[PDB]
Amino acid sequence: TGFHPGIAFTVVRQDRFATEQLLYAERASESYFVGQIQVHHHDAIGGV
């Protein structure tokens, strides 16, 4: 009927805005090692 506030109250609001990102790395950041690659034969759902 009237909604008389006899006590204080608070609300919670959450926001999620997308943001961009910038990437920059120096020479001594990370290294890469090449492994061993081999040819294997498997079975598919309609063939090889």
Binding site: D43, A44, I45, G46, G47
Partner: protein
């Protein structure tokens, strides 16, 4: 060391070719063992003898005793077919999903063509031959389904014979599984298979049960608080053995999808394999 390839109708109607292309992904029943199976369907319902020809049992026996086959694309001039029944195994086969019921991998599945309501089929006016696609379901669920169908048919017959109503609302009768709803006996009309072909079987089962329970109740219980009278018992035993033998256990199908989707719907990518 050769194989058997189906015939390819060259220079056919565009509508017929479109229908064949549309139904190419659907499962196609295998032909006969020796040469060909073309007039078997026509001759199956030839002995009508002035009445409804009993064909449910014959078609069930034919489907149980016959294997299946997988068709390939149609190329004008040359046709290719694959068979893994008695020929050579193939590295994987692609068959579109047909049964709307949900299926789970890693479990043994059976095959049983439904006879209640309606089933998917393909029929051509210029051909005159129809193919019924059996529904594949697990044996554990199939037993419950057939038991529920038998109970519903028995209760419907009792209600129709007693004249006065006898159906008691025991609660909800909706089966839910993985978000799929399945309602049975939602109507009491156009029942073309409820008491047409299985009526004789259910009547035989009922009278056998009645005679057996009467025979046991005659003298068996003791702790409760010129006619040899043996031909009927022998006939009951013979009929029970016959129905047990004809019940069958067709557990040869299996489902195994490599990294397949969780939910299954008609029109997906499944696999066909045996054990």
């Amino acid at each position: 060391p050769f194989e058997i390839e189906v015939l390819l109708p060259g220079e056919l109607s565009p509508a017929e070719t479109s229908a064949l292309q549309k139904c190419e992904g659907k499962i196609i029943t295998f032909s006969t063992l020796r040469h060909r199976a073309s007039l078997v369907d026509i001759a199956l319902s030839s002995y009508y003898i002035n009445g409804a020809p009993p064909d449910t049992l014959s078609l069930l026996e034919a489907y149980r005793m016959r294997f299946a086959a997988v068709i390939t694309r149609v190329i004008p001039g040359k046709l290719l077919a694959h068979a893994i029944g008695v020929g050579t195994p193939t590295p994987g086969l692609f068959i579109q999903n047909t049964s709307p019921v949900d299926l789970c991998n890693g479990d043994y599945i059976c095959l049983l063509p439904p006879v209640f309501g309606s089933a998917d089929s393909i029929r051509l006016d210029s051909v005159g031959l129809e193919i019924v696609f059996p529904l594949t379901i697990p044996q554990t669920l199939m037993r419950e389904i057939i038991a529920k169908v038998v109970a519903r048919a028995v209760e419907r017959t009792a209600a129709g014979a007693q004249i006065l109503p006898h159906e008691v609302l025991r609660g909800a009768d909706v089966i839910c599984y993985n978000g799929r709803r399945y309602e049975l006996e939602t109507n009491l009309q156009h029942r073309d298979g409820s008491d047409a072909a299985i009526r004789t079987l259910v009547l035989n089962l009922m009278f056998s049960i009645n005679e057996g329970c009467l025979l046991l109740l005659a003298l068996i219980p003791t702790l409760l608080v010129r006619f040899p009278i043996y031909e009927t018992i022998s006939s009951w035993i013979s009929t029970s053995s016959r129905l047990g033998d004809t019940l069958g256990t067709r557990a040869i199908l299996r489902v195994c999808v490599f990294d397949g989707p969780s939910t299954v719907h008609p029109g997906d990518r499944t696999a066909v394999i045996q054990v």
